[PDB]
Design a protein around this ligand. Structure first.
Ligand code: G26
Ligand code: G26
Lengths: 99, 99
């Protein structure tokens, strides 16, 4: 679909048997979800936003459905205020900016 | 134009007589620039997200030019990693997400 930005670009995701809402975010290089239960092994890692810095767990090769489209990729899990779909996966479902 | 997200969506802006680059960012509600010379007066505001929170100055009805397009709106200036153009100006220049 096409999405204008008068509202926040929130979409439904399925990950790990669970339904979530998540933000499509061209400003984020990676994907980060709020604390959840993922099976499947992880490495610790850090990311930075506006007010500094967080420690997240990295899980690789995770399947995610984003608004009905599938993707597989790296997903961080951690104390983000909101779930964020970043550029690693937006490229896999074909997402562009237009103006 | 049509921007793909294999690279960060950086664009050239002109503001306050100065040329800059900025990130187009659908996951930011606001526009925030690194510290820089702006004329006028402003209010204390605070924003946050992933590392926590920051202190920014708020200047209203700033003219900005984003890849050739002019827009007027609120700009925050502050200790951000990179210049962000948020949804408040993306709507102005007719910007959509598409997949
Ligand atoms: C301030 C940023 C725009 S710039 C920095 C970015 N890091 C990342 O994108 C990693 C990342 C991944 C996921 C989340 C955050 C950060 C970077 O520096 N990228 C160049 C870079 C390239 C190579 C090496 C090193 C750095 N963080 C971004 C950020 O917090 N964006 C928020 C707004 O969209 C995100 C947000 C949205 C809603 C609520 C809260 C936060
Ligand atoms: C973590 C966020 C996705 S969630 C929070 C957001 N705040 C804002 O959008 C204000 C704002 C504006 C600009 C920047 C940061 C924050 C919010 O809570 N939005 C609902 C809301 C609305 C009104 C009131 C309360 C809550 N910040 C975002 C964020 O940092 N995104 C980064 C990734 O794109 C941004 C980024 C990109 C690259 C490098 C570094 C950072």
């Amino acid at each position: 679909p096409q999405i204008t930005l008068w509202q926040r670009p929130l979409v439904t995701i399925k990950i790990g048997g669970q339904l979530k809402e998540a933000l499509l975010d061209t400003g984020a290089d990676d994907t980060v979800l709020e604390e959840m239960s993922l099976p499947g092994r992880w490495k610790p890692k850090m990311i930075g936003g506006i007010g500094g810095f967080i420690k997240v767990r990295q899980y690789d090769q995770i399947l995610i459905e984003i608004c009905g489209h599938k993707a597989i990729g790296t997903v961080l899990v951690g104390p983000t205020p909101v779930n964020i779909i970043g550029r690693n996966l937006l490229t896999q479902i074909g997402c562009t900016l237009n103006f």
